[PDB]
cytochrome B5
Amino acid sequence: TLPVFTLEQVAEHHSPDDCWMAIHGKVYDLTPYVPNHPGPAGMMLVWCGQESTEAWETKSYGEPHSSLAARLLQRYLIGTL
Ligand code: HEM
């Protein structure tokens, strides 16, 4: 069954070399994905350790992530919030 985390635990993984996020009530360990993120360098890094649903939904300027990107995000799932 999926592990359950709190936002406080997610916040301990807040750096480029140890980056977890909470998106839509789910927790993801995105550390391996960090260097592969497309777009302007370092946009995902500001959200390591955070609840990041709005940034996920809008890319911070008003475009959603694609269905392809949503499949890629799900691979890094580690639990629920
Ligand atoms: C949560 C904070 C995130 C922010 C603010 C963010 C922002 C962005 C931006 C600015 C771009 C380029 C512009 C554009 O494609 O319209 C982009 C593209 C992309 N991002 Fe993110 N991203 C985030 C997280 C993620 C995560 C967690 C993944 C997957 C593991 C991901 C996967 C991708 C992919 C695959 C693209 C290429 C375009 C697409 O398929 O939608 N991003 N992102």
Summary: The radius of gyration is 12 Å.
